[PDB]
Each structure stands twice: as C-alpha cells, then as structure tokens.
Design a binder for this molecule. Structure first.
Ligand SMILES: Nc1ncnc2c1ncn2[C@@H]1O[C@H](COP(=O)(O)OP(=O)(O)O)[C@@H](O)[C@H]1O
Ligand SMILES: [Mg+2]
Lengths: 370, 448
C-alpha cells in the first residue's frame, strides 16, 4: 500500500501520497461557527466550519484557530481538521494505508500521546509514524547536513542536522511565524483610518500581508524612503468595494521577525536564532552549517527574505568563510515533499507504529518509536 | 479544453453502492449524468442506504416529496443529513450549511465513508470454470480476485455466464448447484479476497478414464475393451459381446491397422425399424469379407451371423488378431522398414534418459524394477519437459497396493503428451513383458 504523508500546520495543513512531487491539500486551517439568526426554516445546523468552507463564507461567521503555535488545545475541532485533511484530499482509507505525521519539536508528551491515541482509536490505523517537520524538510533540498529553518504560521524552530545526526541540545522553538505577524499588521493598519478588530477581516489581512508585505533590507532606509517619498504605495481592492492604500505598513510587518520589540517579547529574532543554534553545535561542524541554510515553512517567502537573512548572518559571521542561504521555490511544501521522499524509501517501511505492537505497548508507543 | 473527465466515476460509484439500489434514484444509475452532487449534498442517500438489508425504513417519498417551496428548498438537506447515524459521516468538519451547495473535496470525503461502510491445484480447476468465459469472444477472468478489479468486466462476462449479500448470488449461482453457497462471505466475494476465492473456485470444479472391474469379465476381455477405448472408437465400448454386434466398431478399427474400408457399403448407425437386423447382418458380412481377402486373416468357421449373434469365441479370435496387427504396425513404423526387435528398443530408454540424468535403467521388459511406475514416469517427462509433475510420484515408500495409483497416474498423461498407450495399469503393475513392450513402443512413437 502507498504511504501517506500529512503536513500539519497552524495556517496551512498539507496531505498527499509518498513520492508525489506536487501537494494536494491547499487550504487555510480555520474554524468557524454560525453566529446569526435564521428567520427561515432549515438553517443553523452546523457545529463548526473547517477551512475553505469558512473561507468562502467569511462575513457571517467567526474564525477560530485550534492550533496555537503547534500546541493542540481543543481536540474536538482538531478531529474535524484531520478529517478534512485526510478524506477530502486523500480519498484513500488510512485504515489500510500508512500515514506519516508531522509534529513541531519541543512538544509536550500529552499532545503527542493524544494525537497517537486519536489515530489508533478514532481511526483503525495499521501502521503510523510521527516525524519532525525540520528533519523532513531536509530531504526536500536533497541534503542530509545543515540547519533547516521551519517557520509555519505560529511555529519557528531550528533543528541543526549534521550528517543525519541531530543535536537535541541545539534545538529551540520560537512562537512567531505568521500569526503574530498578522496580529501586528492588523494592529498597525488602524493608523491609516482603518478598523480591524473582528476575525472576518483576518483572512483579507493575511492575503494583503502575503501579496504586499516584504522583508526589507535596511529598516531605517525604508523609513526614510516612506517618509520622504511616496513611491512604495500599493493599493488593495476590498471585497465589499472600498479601496485601501498602504505604503508604510507593508515592510513593517515582516520586520517583526528580526526585531521582536514590535510585539514586546524578550526572545531574539529569527536571524539570531540560527546563529545561536550553530554556536551550540561543534566547532568542527560549523562549516557544514554556515553553507547549508535550507528555508521552509509558510513564512519565509517574502520578497527579500533571503538577501536580508544573508546580510544578517554575514554581520554575525567572523568574516572567515562564505554564508549560503537556500530558498527553494517549494518552501511551502518542503516538509511534505521530504516526508513523501522518505516514506517512499524501502527502509522507512520497517519502523511504522503498528497497531498490534501498540495494543500491548500502550499510549507511549510513539515516544520511543519516533 | 477538457469537456469531460469523470464519467467513469459514475459507473464506479454505481458498482460500489449497488449495496443499496435505492441510492440509484439519487446518484446516476450508470447513465453517466451529474445528478449526484446536489441531492447527495442534501443527504438523501444517507437515509436511502438503510434499504440495503430491509426496505422497511425511511422512504424516499416519505422524508421528501418536494414540499420544498419554490423559494426555500432549505428543509430537505438538514432533514436528510441528520439521519447520517448510519455508516457515519467521519468528516465531522462538514455541516449541512456547506453541503447545501456541495464542494468537490467535501463530497469525495463523504463518499469515502459511503464506500468504506457501505460494503461489509487451484488453477487446473479454475480453467474448467474459465472455459465458458470465452463464449463468442472475450478474455477470461481467471479467479474473481486476479483480473477483475471492479464489477465492470465481471458483470459484462456474467451477461454470458449467467445488496452485496444478494449480489454475491451472481458468483454463487454456479456454486448453488452443489450447495456450496455459504462459507464465502459476500463482503469478501465482492471485494475479491484472494484466499477465499482460490479454494472456493478450485473445490467446485474438481468433479466437472474408465478403470473399473466388472462382475464377470476375464483379464483378456478387459484388455480388449481398454485397447479399443484407448484407440479412439466413436462409441464407448462397455461390453464386447453387446457393442460389436453391429460391426461398426470393427470397421473403425480396420482403418487403424491400415486396412482400407469402403464406407459406401456400410449402413449408418441410424437404422430403420424395418430390416435393421438385415442391415446389421450385412455390416457383419462386409466386415468379415474385408478381414478375409485384403487383410489376410485366419478365421475358420466365422461368419457374419456369429458377430451379429455375439459369439464370444469367434469375436475374441478376431479382436486379439486385430491387436496382433496393431502391435505389428506399431513395431514396424518405428523402424526403417519391416523390422521389429526388442533389444534395439530396450536401450533407447537407457540412452535418452542420459540427456537429463536419472537413476532409472532397465535390462529388459522382464525386470522386476518396473513393478512400480517409477521407470515409466522417469521417461514420460524426458521427451516432454513440460510434464515433470512429480507431485503424486512414489519412490522408496511404495507397497503392493499403493503403486496402482501411481501406475494409473503415469498411464493417464501418456495420452496427454501424445503416447497412444492402450495399456491397463495392472499390466504395468505386474511384469508382463509383452505389453509393457507395447507401452515403450507407443513411447518411442512420440519420442522420435
Ligand atoms: N508568499 C508569502 N509571503 C509571506 N507570507 C506568507 C506567504 N504565504 C503564506 N504566508 C504566511 O505564512 C503563514 C502560513 O504558514 P503555513 O503554510 O501554515 O506553514 P507550514 O508550511 O510550515 O505549515 C500564513 O500566515 C501566511 O500569511
Ligand atoms: Mg508546517
């Protein structure tokens, strides 16, 4: 039976077979609930929206994100999310198909245990596996040595891998990928006579961020250009009919990744995180780490993220040897493509978490099988 | 661009969901239309699906008779989708709000549950089932688990070889003849489960040469009857003195010993109710005349009336002589001319078995090592490598009684490869040197 690879994420959740070069599941991961009164009979008969079914009706509904930076709080909506991801984009039976799961690092044991039980009890799975997104994204670039910066919608972690081996003591996690960026953008959009409070405009704000916001090279120079000239002023067409125009709050939103002081947190930025991870590794393996910086996740596609990151790392470099930033075009699906490649291998068939072993092992079977 | 991409999906859904034929009033009924999306989004199939086992359930016209007024058609979708307790919409993400219109991915995900819960040697005998699949002309299914994946080709050939609990009756009708209906679950039958299907098809057609002992019959008459049966007589000779009274079998045997027969003087087996005895007497007289002058037989005191009246002595005196010429011809056509010998033909088996190499070598036909059928089966596959079949052979663990079975086993396929062996298994079990010689003579005919 063909293996299945599912890439879960706070904003986008991916699924597909093992071996395919193109993704299948392309949908926002949102939850909506009815909130208006139906004067006509036959309406109000839904518990929770999931994904594009709420995206297409984002006027009369709310938006709920059950995934909070890779943390699974309410499993009732996550059941719906996984049901959406699997049957609507695989159409195969997981009950007789192996499925490869993704999970953010530094995840408490309760989350992994519960997502394992859900697979082994709500579903009837013959053999599952749980893999780290950063490790899987390394196979997409065709390399086995170097750090991978996986930045989704609320998860930003750096797992350095050297010749297949990973360093547990050099693994950290940052909760700033796309969600706090969206919050910062919708907060700063109110400085131009705009109102952004309800979640019905959150998808529009995210789209505006995706098609306007870009990582700037020099923030002070961008401030000077925006204050003096008015050349970086691009307009957006609101779905209802009004026209907005933002020129300063475009490159301000992506700058929060490098400057955490905008949202007020004591953690460092994304450029210092990989440097600190490398510093936590061996001094004889930094050569393979500076020249191998594979980008992935839903965040790092801003127009000017690679050059800015290269400049930031070069400023942090001791001016000894070259820095290489890898930004593949399929950064949105590097994790899924790598998982499909790994599951397609003949070796990967011999450590899936089978149900018969789980029956006598117990809930902690994923903890030493993954 | 593309105007059509998925008409085959309609047929697939039909063959999968014929568990409930009432769903065919919502989904297309094999005419590849597009009625599925809107009505399935209303959940009508969910209430219909219960009619799989018992029709006494939510009726299609009882839950919905289209009192969905020309403005509000919003009442049927939630009313029918709330009855999704059966099978279970494992996609709990979707509500009846989005299913009001329907989405491709959502409909596919719900159809996934519909398909999943809606449904709950061997080859030598399988070919005796596949023989009828040819009909006018088409390929053969083989087992129900090998070639057919869906019900398309199976139903197409069922049109010629004519609820899954009742749709399995299509496969079981050829099994209901002997009562072998149960012990093969319809869910696995439709799903094409291999292991259940191989044995089920195999054991069915195991009963789809005559070696029996009559109450009164000498070994000589048994040899006669077996010889004529193995030579290919048009009737089936069961009694020597009751089937040769028409002299038709004798005439059939005549051309096989190179005696020309004029069939224009022979009365056909259809006999008028008047003068049939006269026609049979004429046939016997013509057979005697053909045996006398051009055939040079020694039959003193034998006439047509003796064969017509079934005189045992004179009939045996003719048949044994017929085999005398038949064996003479078999031993003469093998050589260059009119020479026949036993020592020239006894080392042939010793020489041709050295091509492969096996520990079977005989000195003559009187050796006791040919008491079992090991020597003949060692040679029967030397000429034809495709008949190895040592499954039923016995070597070193054979008693007096059990070697009859392997003797018959070795004799039976001799005609399969091409040796026109007219030998009883008993004559090979014993060390009768005259007729195992005929066995080897028939072997040499196909050998070279
Ligand atoms: N082209 C883009 N440029 C900038 N940001 C983007 C782009 N595409 C998506 N994003 C942002 O990234 C987040 C989506 O992350 P996601 O796709 O869930 O990551 P992952 O692939 O690791 O699961 C959303 O906030 C979205 O706004
Ligand atoms: Mg991700």
């Amino acid at each position: 039976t063909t293996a299945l690879v599912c890439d879960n994420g706070s904003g986008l959740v991916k699924a597909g077979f093992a071996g395919d070069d193109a993704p299948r599941a392309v949908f926002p991961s949102i939850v909506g609930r009815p909130r208006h009164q139906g004067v006509m009979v036959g309406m109000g008969q839904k518990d929770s929206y999931v994904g594009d079914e709420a995206q297409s009706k984002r006027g009369i509904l709310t938006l709920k994100y059950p995934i909070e930076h890779g943390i699974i709080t309410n499993w009732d909506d996550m059941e719906k999310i996984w049901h959406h991801t699997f049957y609507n984009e695989l159409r195969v039976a997981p009950e007789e198909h192996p499925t490869l799961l993704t999970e953010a690092p530094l995840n408490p044991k309760a989350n992994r245990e519960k997502m394992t039980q859900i697979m082994f009890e709500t579903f009837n799975v013959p053999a599952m596996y749980v893999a780290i997104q950063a490790v899987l994204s390394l196979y997409a670039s065709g390399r086995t040595t170097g750090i991978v910066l996986d930045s989704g919608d609320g998860v930003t972690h750096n797992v350095p891998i050297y010749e297949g081996y990973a360093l547990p003591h050099a693994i950290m996690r940052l909760d700033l990928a796309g969600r706090d960026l969206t919050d910062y953008l919708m907060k700063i959009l109110t400085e131009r006579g705009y109102s952004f409070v309800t979640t019905a405009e959150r998808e529009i704000v995210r789209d505006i961020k995706e098609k306007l916001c870009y990582v700037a090279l020099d923030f002070e120079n961008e401030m000077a250009t925006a204050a003096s000239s008015s050349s970086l002023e691009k307009s957006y067409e609101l779905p209802d009919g009004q026209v907005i125009t933002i020129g300063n709050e475009r490159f301000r939103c992506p700058e929060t990744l490098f400057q955490p002081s905008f949202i007020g947190m004591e953690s460092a930025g994304i450029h210092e995180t990989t440097y600190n991870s490398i510093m936590k590794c061996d001094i004889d393996i930094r050569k393979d780490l500076y020249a191998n910086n594979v980008m992935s996740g839903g965040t790092t596609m801003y127009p000017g993220i690679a050059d800015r990151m290269q400049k930031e790392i070069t400023a942090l470099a001791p001016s000894t040897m070259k820095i290489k930033i890898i930004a593949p075009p399929e950064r949105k699906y590097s994790v899924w493509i790598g998982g499909s490649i790994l599951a397609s291998l003949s070796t990967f068939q011999q450590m899936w978490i089978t149900k018969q072993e789980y029956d006598e092992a117990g809930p902690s079977i994923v903890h030493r099988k993954c | 661009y593309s105007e059509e991409e998925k008409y085959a999906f309609v047929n697939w859904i039909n063959k999968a969901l014929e568990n409930d034929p009432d769903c065919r009033h919502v989904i297309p009924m094999n005419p590849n239309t597009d009625d599925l999306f809107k009505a399935v989004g209303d959940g009508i199939v969910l209430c219909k699906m219960i009619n799989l086992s018992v029709p006494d359930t939510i009726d299609e016209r009882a839950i919905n008779k289209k009192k969905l007024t020309p403005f509000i058609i919003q009442e049927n979708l939630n009313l029918a989708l709330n009855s999704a307790s059966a099978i279970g919409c494992h996609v709990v993400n979707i509500g009846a709000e989005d299913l009001r219109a329907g989405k491709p991915h959502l409909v596919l995900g719900l159809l996934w549950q519909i398909i999943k819960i809606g449904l709950f040697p061997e080859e030598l005998l399988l070919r005796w089932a596949n023989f009828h699949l040819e009909n006018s002309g088409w390929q053969k299914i083989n087992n129900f688990s090998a070639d057919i994946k869906d019900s398309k080709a199976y139903f197409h050939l069922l049109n010629q070889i004519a609820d899954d609990l009742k749709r399995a009756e299509s496969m079981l009708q050829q099994a209901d003849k002997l009562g072998c209906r149960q012990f093969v679950t319809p869910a696995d039958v439709v799903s094409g489960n291999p292991k259940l299907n191989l044995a089920f098809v195999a054991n069915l057609f195991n009963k789809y040469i005559d070696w029996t002992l009559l109450e009164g019959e000498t070994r000589e008459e048994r040899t006669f009857r077996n010889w004529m049966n193995s030579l290919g007589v048009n009737p089936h000779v069961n009694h020597l003195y009751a089937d040769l009274q028409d002299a038709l079998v004798i005439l059939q045997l005549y051309e096989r010993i190179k005696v020309p027969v004029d069939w224009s003087k022979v009365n056909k087996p259809p006999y008028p109710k008047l003068g049939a005895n006269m026609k049979k007497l004429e046939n016997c007289n013509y057979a005697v005349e053909l045996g006398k002058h051009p055939a040079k037989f020694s039959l003193v005191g034998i006439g047509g009336q003796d064969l017509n009246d079934g005189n045992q002595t004179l009939t045996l005196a003719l048949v044994w002589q017929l085999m005398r010429r038949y064996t003479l011809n078999v031993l003469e056509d093998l050589g260059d001319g009119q020479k026949a010998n036993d020592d020239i033909i006894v080392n042939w088996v010793n020489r041709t078995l050295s091509e492969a190499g096996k520990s079977t070598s005989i000195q003559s036909f009187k050796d006791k090592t040919i008491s079992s059928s090991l020597a003949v089966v060692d040679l029967i596959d030397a000429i034809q490598p495709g008949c190895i079949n040592y499954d039923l052979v016995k070597s070193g663990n054979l008693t007096e009684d059990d070697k009859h079975n392997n003797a018959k086993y070795a004799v039976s396929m001799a005609r399969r490869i091409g040796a026109r062996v007219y030998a009883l298994p008993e004559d090979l079990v014993e060390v009768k040197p005259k007729m195992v010689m005929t066995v080897f003579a028939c072997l040499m005919g196909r050998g070279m």
